[PDB]
Amino acid sequence: MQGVNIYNISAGTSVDLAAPVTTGDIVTFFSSALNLNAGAGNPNNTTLNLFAENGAYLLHIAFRLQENVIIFNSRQPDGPWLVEQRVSDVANQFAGIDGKAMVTVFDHGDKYQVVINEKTVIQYTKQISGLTSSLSYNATEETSIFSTVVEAVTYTGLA
Amino acid sequence: MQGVNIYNISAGTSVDLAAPVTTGDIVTFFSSALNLNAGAGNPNNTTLNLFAENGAYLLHIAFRLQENVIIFNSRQPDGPWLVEQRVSDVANQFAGIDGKAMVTVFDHGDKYQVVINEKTVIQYTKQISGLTSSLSYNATEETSIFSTVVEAVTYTGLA
Numbered sequence: 001m002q003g004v005n006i007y008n009i010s011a012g013t014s015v016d017l018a019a020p021v022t023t024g025d026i027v028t029f030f031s032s033a034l035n036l037n038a039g040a041g042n043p044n045n046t047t048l049n050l051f052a053e054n055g056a057y058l059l060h061i062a063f064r065l066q067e068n069v070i071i072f073n074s075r076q077p078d079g080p081w082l083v084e085q086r087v088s089d090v091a092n093q094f095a096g097i098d099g100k101a102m103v104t105v106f107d108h109g110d111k112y113q114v115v116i117n118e119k120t121v122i123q124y125t126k127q128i129s130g131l132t133s134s135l136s137y138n139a140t141e142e143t144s145i146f147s148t149v150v151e152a153v154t155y156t157g158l159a
Numbered sequence: 160m161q162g163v164n165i166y167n168i169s170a171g172t173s174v175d176l177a178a179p180v181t182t183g184d185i186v187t188f189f190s191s192a193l194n195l196n197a198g199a200g201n202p203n204n205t206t207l208n209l210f211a212e213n214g215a216y217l218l219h220i221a222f223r224l225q226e227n228v229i230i231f232n233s234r235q236p237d238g239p240w241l242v243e244q245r246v247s248d249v250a251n252q253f254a255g256i257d258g259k260a261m262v263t264v265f266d267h268g269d270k271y272q273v274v275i276n277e278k279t280v281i282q283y284t285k286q287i288s289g290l291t292s293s294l295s296y297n298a299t300e301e302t303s304i305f306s307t308v309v310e311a312v313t314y315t316g317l318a
């Protein structure tokens with residue numbers, strides 16, 4: 001049974017998925033803006049996260065304009081941040097598309113494939129496994145590189 | 160490989176896919192507008208098409224405001240239109256979201272699952288088989304129910 005769910009996530013909020021995302025599923029965050037000249041984050045301008053039921057950060061995608069890097073990481077609910085994987089030059093990863101952008105995450109079971117628009121920037125080996133039951137779009141309106149509200153679409157029941 | 164391809168389709172035009180759509184793959188048409196009171200179609204207000212390389216209409220989705228129906232059909236390169244499938248009440252299929260719309264098509268091998276926003280509108284049994292190599296969005300800026308430019312996003316290599 002394949003299904004499409006739509007969530008309108010306001011900057012700085014988490015949302016519970018009606019249909020969990022598991023291996024073979026896809027989630028795409030759509031932003032109606034691209035602000036590569038936003039303020040400084042603490043230290044993230046924007047972070048996109050996939051959470052496990054217990055609150056673990058299965059996948060943490062951090063966009064840093066100042067440190068000019070996209071960080072990928074995970075962490076147990078009450079644990080320290082784990083081993084960071086990085087992709088330098090935020091602007092360049094969004095090159096080609098202006099005033100809008102999208103971030104797609106493919107759950108491949110043992111890894112998460114993250115695509116920025118059409119560019120796959122990383123095949124992130126998972127540090128924590130499990131299904132994703134909630135998502136969050138973290139940022140302040142003034143420092144986020146994305147629009148105030150990001151539309152998240154999940155394609156589930158794919159495998 | 161699994162990948163994302165983004166296309167900007169202007170009303171009355173088509174695009175060649177960078178990665179063909181086959182069984183297991185997904186395609187979503189995004190409209191930044193939704194006018195369910197445009198004029199009457201001629202007879203179509205808006206059509207979204209999945210084409211095979213030879214020109215066959217693997218899947219033709221036509222919205223007709225005056226007939227208040229959404230038609231699904233197929234057609235060979237130089238053959239007649241095949242058996243029409245219809246689903247009444249256009250507005251109801253879009254109920255829930257206004258000012259915009261989303262049409263997703265899952266290629267399930269023997270059928271195309273068509274979902275409008277989060278609602279599955281039809282499990283269309285294929286009348287023609289094959290890989291989708293091109294897409295089109297046909298309408299006039301005058302009577303289309305969608306925005307003048309429709310964004311198509313494909314998720315391929317999923318199988």
Ligand SMILES: OC[C@H]1O[C@@H](O[C@H]2[C@H](O)[C@@H](O)[C@H](O)O[C@@H]2CO)[C@H](O)[C@@H](O)[C@H]1O
Nearest residue numbers: 042043044060062071072073081082084
């Ligand atoms: O790993 C994601 C996590 O990073 C934190 O900052 C890290 C910093 O990236 C690292 O280089 C340094 O050694 O440790 C810092 C944490 O003490 C961010 O603060 C956090 O929000 C996440 O983005």
Ligand SMILES: OC[C@H]1O[C@@H](O[C@H]2[C@H](O)[C@@H](O)[C@H](O)O[C@@H]2CO)[C@H](O)[C@@H](O)[C@H]1O
Nearest residue numbers: 202203219221230231232233240241243
């Ligand atoms: O099937 C899609 C195809 O329909 C054509 O119109 C049909 C009409 O819908 C049907 O009721 C009638 O019996 O036959 C017509 C074709 O001769 C449209 O003209 C065409 O553009 C497609 O939308």
